[PDB]
Amino acid sequence: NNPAIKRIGNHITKSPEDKREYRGLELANGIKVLLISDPTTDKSSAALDVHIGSLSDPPNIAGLSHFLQHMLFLGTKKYPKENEYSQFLSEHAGSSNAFTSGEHTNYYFDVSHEHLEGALDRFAQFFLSPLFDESAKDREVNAVDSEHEKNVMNDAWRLFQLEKATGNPKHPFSKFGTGNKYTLETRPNQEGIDVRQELLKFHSAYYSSNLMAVVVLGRESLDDLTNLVVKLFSEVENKNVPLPEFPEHPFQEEHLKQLYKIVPIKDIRNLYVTFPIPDLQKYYKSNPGHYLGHLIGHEGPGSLLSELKSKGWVNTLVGGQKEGARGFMFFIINVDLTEEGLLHVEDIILHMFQYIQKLRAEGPQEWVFQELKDLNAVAFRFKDKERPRGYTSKIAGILHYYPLEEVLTAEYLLEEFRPDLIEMVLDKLRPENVRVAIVSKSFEGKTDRTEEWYGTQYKQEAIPDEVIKKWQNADLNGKFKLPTKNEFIPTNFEILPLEKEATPYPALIKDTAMSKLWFKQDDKFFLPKANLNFEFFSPFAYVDPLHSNMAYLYLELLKDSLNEYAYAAELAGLSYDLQNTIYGMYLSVKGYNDKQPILLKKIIEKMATFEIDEKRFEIIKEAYMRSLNNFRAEQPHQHAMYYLRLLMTEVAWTKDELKEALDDVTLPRLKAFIPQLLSRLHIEALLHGNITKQAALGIMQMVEDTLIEHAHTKPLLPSQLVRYREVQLPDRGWFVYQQRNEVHNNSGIEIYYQTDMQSTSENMFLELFAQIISEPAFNTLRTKEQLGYIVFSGPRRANGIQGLRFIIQSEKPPHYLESRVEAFLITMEKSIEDMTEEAFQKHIQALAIRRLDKPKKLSAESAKYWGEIISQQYNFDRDNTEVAYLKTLTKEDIIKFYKEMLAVDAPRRHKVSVHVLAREMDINLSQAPALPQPEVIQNMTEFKRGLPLFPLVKPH
Ligand SMILES: COC(=O)[C@H](Cc1cnc[nH]1)NC(=O)CN(CC(=O)O)Cc1ccccc1
Ligand SMILES: [Zn+2]
C-alpha cells in the first residue's frame, strides 16, 4: 500500500505497566524507525543514530567523525542560521546533545510537545545537507581542541587511550577518536587537505540511510507520527554502505602475556586484568558474559572480592564483559590496590585464576541463570518510565542490534540457557591470554615510553613464563564458594490501594522533638517501589575538621562492613546511599518495597552498634588521605566552584584543613566519636511510594526505636537546628579570589552576581533572565568567541540566597574571561530592548513548560519534595505559584531588574569572582566595558568576618 515504507513490524513487546504505544518500521531507504505515542508527555523527543563512528576516521585525520558531529549543529541549506537549531530548541523548552563512539554517532533532542514537527524538521536537515560553513569550521575546531584539552590529564581517558596504543597499531582500534586542533586543522593545512571537503566527503560516504535508526516520541498518534517520519526522512539517500566489521582482534598473539606499568595523574593504585574474547553480542538471548560477570564480579560471601578484601589487598572489584566493536570484545577484572596489594599483585592474580578455576570445577549452573532471568524479568516489568530524550537516544542505538519487535525487551529478557557458551567463554579466561596493567605513582622515573596523545608515561614487559605457569597451575582455594539463593529477591508486588485521606503533596504526619515525618502515598506511578529519605542532624558532624573526618570515616567503615550483605539487596533492585553531610548524616533507601524494612533495619542496627575492624580503618583512612590529596588534580572549573562554596558559606572546612586534621584521627578517637554523634539527633524524613500512612509511621518509629535501644539517642532542641547562612555582599562591591591549578593547563573562572533572598518574585526575575540569556551565552562565549568547551550560565542557589553565575574553563586568562562576560551582558540588555514582545512571551512560555514538566518516575517526584524539605522551604506547590507569577512579567520588569542588580553600573551589583589560573601564569568582537578595580581576597576567614550574613528563608 505505501511506496515509502519497506514494512511495519509486528507488535512491539512492552512491559504491561507501560501505557505508551509503539510502532516499529523500516522505511524504503532502509532507516529502522521506532515511533512512540505518549499523549501525556510534556516534552517530545527524537533521536537518530548512525552506525558510523571514529573507527571509520580516515587514518590521516583523527577525530573527523567527532568533528563532524559538532559541525552538523552549525547550519544546513534549509536553516542556514548558524544557531537556528539551538535557538529554536531554547525557545521551545528543548535541549540537545550528541556523542561519537567507535561505531556510532547519536543525535538527540527534546522540545515542548507542541513544537515537535518544528524541531524535527530542523533536525532532519543535519542528515540531508549540512553547510559545514568555512567560518564555523575554523571556530568549532577550538571547541573540539578544548574538549580534548579537558580530557588530557584525566586518568580514565589516558587509560582508555593507552589500551588502544598497545594493541595492533594497524587496527582501527588504535585510532584517536576525539581529535584536536593539531589533528583537525594544523596538520591538515600542512598537508594541503581542505577539511570542509573532507566533512562533505565523509558525510556523503557514510551518512547513508541504510546505516540509520530514528526514534520519535510525541503526543501524536502512531499514524500521525508515521506520516511525519516518512515525510522528513524518506529523502535521506541510500548509498548502501557495507557496515564496517572488525573480525580480527586488536590484541593478537604478541599483545598477550604483557605487563604494563603506568604512572597516573592522581595518586591512585589500580590493577587492570584483561582477556580478549570474541564478540558475544549475537548471544544476547543467553548472555554468557553477563553470567560470568555476575560471578566473577560478585561481592557476597564466597566471592573473589571477599577474599581479596580479607587479605587487605583490595577494596573494590569490577568484572565482566566490556564492549569492543563488531568482531571483538574484552573480559575484564579490575581492582583498586591497598599499599599491601600493590606488592602482591602476582598473588592477587593467582587468586583470580583460582576463582576462575572454581567455576570450571562446578560447571555452569542453571539456577544461577534462572535468577538472572527472574531479576531481569522483574526489572523489566517494573522499569521506571524514562525521560523522553534519554529514551529515544538509547533505542536509536539499539535499533541497530535487535529485531524491531524486540528492541524494548532485548536488553532485559534472557531466554536461553547455554552451558556450551558459558564454558566456551570461560575457556578464554586463561593465563596464556592475559594482559596486566598496574597503575601506581611508584613507577615515576622508572618508565621508558610515552603515549603520544595524552603523554602517559608507562613501561611494557613480557610477563615471565615462571609466572604464567604458576597461574596455569592454580588449584582450588577453599575460601571460594558460589553465591547461594538470593533471599532479597522480592516477590510481593501488590500495589496497596489508594487511601481515603491520601494527599497530592507530602503531609507532615509526625512533628516530635525527635523526628519530623513527611509522607505521601504514591498516586501517580503504581510500581511496587518506595523511597525512604532521612536527614539526621547532629552538631558534632561538622563542629570541626576532625569531626568531619570522623563522620566520613565512620560512614565509609559502615558501608564497607555492610557491603557483602548489602550486595544481594542491590542485585534485587534494592539499594541505599549513606553519607555524611555538613548537618550530620543522610540515608536513602530506594527500590522494591517488598523487603525494604529489612535492609533499613539492618543499616540502623549496624549504625548504632558498630565495631570497627582496625585493619579496615587503617586502609580506609589511607584511601581518604589520597582522596583529599587528589583534589588538586580535579579540573580548573571544579576548583572555581569549590572556592566559591567556601567563600560564600558561613562555615566550611577546606580540603587542606581536613587533611591536616586527618593524621590526628585514631582508632580510640573514632570509637569514642560514634556514640557521641548518635547521642543526640533530629530526624527529618520523607517516605514516598507504594506504602501506607501506618506502614510509614512504623518505619519511622522503628528507626527511632533502634537508635534509642542501642545508642540511647535523645532529641535535639529546635534552637540547635542551625542551618548555615550566605555571606552578604555590599552594594557595588567586587571581590576576586585567585588560585593556581597545578595539574591542568587550562584556567577556570566562576562569576557570581548575587541578587537577593529566594522568593516568588526574586526567583522568577533571575529565572527568566537566565532563560533569555541561556542560549545566547552559549552561542556568544563558545560558538562565536570560542573561549572554551565548558561554558555554563544559569541561577546559583545556596543557603536560601541566589544570583546568576557564569562558569568557563579556558586557555585564555581569567581577567580576559571577565571582560568577555561583561561584554556579553551588555549585548544582552540590548537584545532584550530590541526583542519583540512576542519573542518575550515565548521565553515565558518556555520556562513555564520547563518548570511545569511532570516527573516521569517516583524518584524524580521524591527529589523535588526532598529539595523542598532539605532547604526548609516546604513549598510543595511552588511550581504553579511561580509560574502564575512569571506570566505577569513584562520586558520592562526585566530591564529594571537587570539595571538594578546586574548591569556594570548597577546600584545593587554584588559581584564575586573566583579566578583559577592554569599550570603556568601570574576585532569581530563586541565592546567590553571598563571595570572597577577589584578587592582581592587574601584570606577566606578575614573576608567572611568583614561582612554581614543574610537571614535564612522563612518556611512556607
Ligand atoms: C553482570 O554484572 C557485572 O558484570 C558487573 C557487576 C560488578 C559488581 N562488582 C563488580 N562487578 N558490572 C560490570 O562489569 C559493569 N558493566 C560492565 C563493565 O564495564 O565491566 C556492566 C553493567 C553496567 C550497567 C548496568 C548493568 C551492567
Ligand atoms: Zn564533542
GROMACS .gro file of C-alpha atoms and ligand atoms in nm, residues 290 293-294 297 299 317-321 332 567, ligand 1:
model
   39
  290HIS     CA    1   2.676  -1.141   3.190
  293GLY     CA    2   3.038  -1.115   3.508
  294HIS     CA    3   2.777  -1.179   3.770
  297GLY     CA    4   3.221  -0.963   3.999
  299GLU     CA    5   3.063  -0.917   4.619
  317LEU     CA    6   3.640  -0.500   4.211
  318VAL     CA    7   3.475  -0.473   3.869
  319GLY     CA    8   3.437  -0.781   3.648
  320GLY     CA    9   3.277  -0.893   3.327
  321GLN     CA   10   3.237  -0.819   2.964
  332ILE     CA   11   3.788  -0.756   3.246
  567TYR     CA   12   2.520  -0.661   4.763
  957LIG     C1   13   2.663  -0.853   3.531
  957LIG     O1   14   2.736  -0.794   3.640
  957LIG     C2   15   2.871  -0.740   3.617
  957LIG     O2   16   2.929  -0.789   3.520
  957LIG     C3   17   2.942  -0.632   3.699
  957LIG     C4   18   2.887  -0.616   3.840
  957LIG     C5   19   3.003  -0.598   3.933
  957LIG     C6   20   2.990  -0.556   4.068
  957LIG     N1   21   3.113  -0.555   4.125
  957LIG     C7   22   3.197  -0.593   4.022
  957LIG     N2   23   3.134  -0.621   3.903
  957LIG     N3   24   2.933  -0.498   3.640
  957LIG     C8   25   3.012  -0.460   3.537
  957LIG     O3   26   3.100  -0.530   3.486
  957LIG     C9   27   2.987  -0.318   3.483
  957LIG     N4   28   2.933  -0.314   3.345
  957LIG    C10   29   3.033  -0.369   3.250
  957LIG    C11   30   3.181  -0.330   3.264
  957LIG     O4   31   3.225  -0.225   3.216
  957LIG     O5   32   3.257  -0.410   3.321
  957LIG    C12   33   2.807  -0.391   3.324
  957LIG    C13   34   2.675  -0.316   3.355
  957LIG    C14   35   2.669  -0.174   3.369
  957LIG    C15   36   2.545  -0.110   3.397
  957LIG    C16   37   2.427  -0.186   3.413
  957LIG    C17   38   2.432  -0.328   3.400
  957LIG    C18   39   2.555  -0.392   3.372
   0.00000   0.00000   0.00000
